[PDB]
Design a protein around this ligand. Structure first.
Ligand SMILES: Cc1nc(-c2ccc(C(=O)O)s2)cs1
Length: 283
């Protein structure tokens, strides 16, 4: 496994940060005029990244189409993903209008609501069956239908209504619940267990809209979920599977959203995720 020799090289030489900065240095910088404007400044989780203007998801409202989210389109792999900030209290309604307008089936959440003592997002889904949520500003109802609580994650069925017209759709919320406060998980096994369960739902498949995933600054794990999925997929696609170069794939994703993969631990972990996984894919 070549990636693996290069991986092991790197390990022995203590080069993560140095490879990491290199990618940072060659990354893509694109304008983000929209995020940065006065009116839409209440709409951004702070500290947070900015959606480039060429890639941003447009809301279908005629007065502020703004949301902190991006479309990542991977031509080779035939995968698209929407990456976004954990919603704020003032943007919960926005988040669900995006999910509706974009025909998504799944939402993936890679963090806890509260971490390291602070709120990392607003509690954006109903906690109980009997108590649904109404977002008057975007005219939408959200009802919890079922909950499946497992050892590392939890999966939920949701029913979202478009109150203007009466349509309803099922949305599945996949939540990874055991990403440690500090660092990265030792083994990627649960992480890969989790990615295939999402795959299995149909939420990443071309017959649905793009999967919405949330990455919130100081903690932007989602980059890894996408990076990992795209490489594995390409390994199943090409003739020469050893030609998949995660660095290159990463930079490619970076043309669409700034700063995906937040650290050298996270890059290392990304290699790990893939190597295993590939290995499991061999049997
Ligand atoms: C059939 C599959 N092959 C791979 C890989 C095979 C070999 C690799 C390598 O040696 O680098 S990656 C992943 S899934």
């Amino acid at each position: 496994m070549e990636m693996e020799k290069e991986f092991e090289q790197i390990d022995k030489s203590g080069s993560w940060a140095a490879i990491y900065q290199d990618i940072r240095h060659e990354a893509s910088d694109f304008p983000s005029r929209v995020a940065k404007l006065p009116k839409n400044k209440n709409r951004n989780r702070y500290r947070d990244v900015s959606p480039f203007d060429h890639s941003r998801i447009k809301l279908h409202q005629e007065d502020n189409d703004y949301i902190n989210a991006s479309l990542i389109k991977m031509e080779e792999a035939q995968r698209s993903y929407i990456l976004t900030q954990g919603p704020l209290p003032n943007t919960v309604g926005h988040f669900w209008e995006m999910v509706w307008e974009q025909k998504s089936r799944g939402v993936v959440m890679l963090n806890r609501v509260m971490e390291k003592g602070s709120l990392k997002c607003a509690q954006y889904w109903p906690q109980k069956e009997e108590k649904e949520m109404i977002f008057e500003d975007t005219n939408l109802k959200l009802t919890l239908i079922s909950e499946d609580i497992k050892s590392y994650y939890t999966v939920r069925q949701l029913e979202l209504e478009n109150l203007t017209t009466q349509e309803t759709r099922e949305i599945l919320h996949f939540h990874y619940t055991t990403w440690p406060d500090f660092g990265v998980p030792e083994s990627p096994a649960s992480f890969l267990n989790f990615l295939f369960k999402v795959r299995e739902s149909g939420s990443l498949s071309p017959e649905h809209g793009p999967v919405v995933v949330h990455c919130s600054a100081g903690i932007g794990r989602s980059g890894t979920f996408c990076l990992a999925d795209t490489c594995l997929l390409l390994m199943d696609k090409r003739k020469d599977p050893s030609s998949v170069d995660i660095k290159k794939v990463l930079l490619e994703m970076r043309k669409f959203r700034m700063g995906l993969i937040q650290t050298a631990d996270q890059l290392r972990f990304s290699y790990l995720a893939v190597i295993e996984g590939a290995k499991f894919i061999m049997g």
